[PDB]
Design a protein around this ligand. Sequence first.
Ligand SMILES: [Ca+2]
Length: 161
Amino acid sequence: VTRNVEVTAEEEKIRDKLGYEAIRDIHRDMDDDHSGSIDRNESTGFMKEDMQMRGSERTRRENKFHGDDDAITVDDLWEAWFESIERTWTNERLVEWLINDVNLPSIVEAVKAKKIDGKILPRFASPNSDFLNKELGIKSSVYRQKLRLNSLDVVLFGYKD
Ligand SMILES: [Ca+2]
């Protein structure tokens, strides 16, 4: 029922439609002037305001997000996410993260049953809150908020800990 095949980022936009659309929603949320690209002022601004990140936490992440690219398009963001090690996380690795970093043991049995993996992280991180609420059944607003922000951090800037 399942086979392992080499796919391109473009092909995966179609196959992982909900993940791509999540990445696109995140990008629109960060793209404050709607230019279609995220600049260094927008990305740090987003960290500062929407992710409530202190100055000392931002510069490392700015560099990871941008590199030498001063203007991150949706395609750029999708490509970086598509290529990321975190997208490859197993269900096991994802549960390890929920326990050790996010501290949300209450959602673990749902995550395990649904067999979701690293590919779900953008949907966790999406400013459209319907997936965490309705699909995973996370009733707590506080819990959703915390998973969303931790997922954003990992989707946008990679895992570090
Ligand atoms: Ca912009």
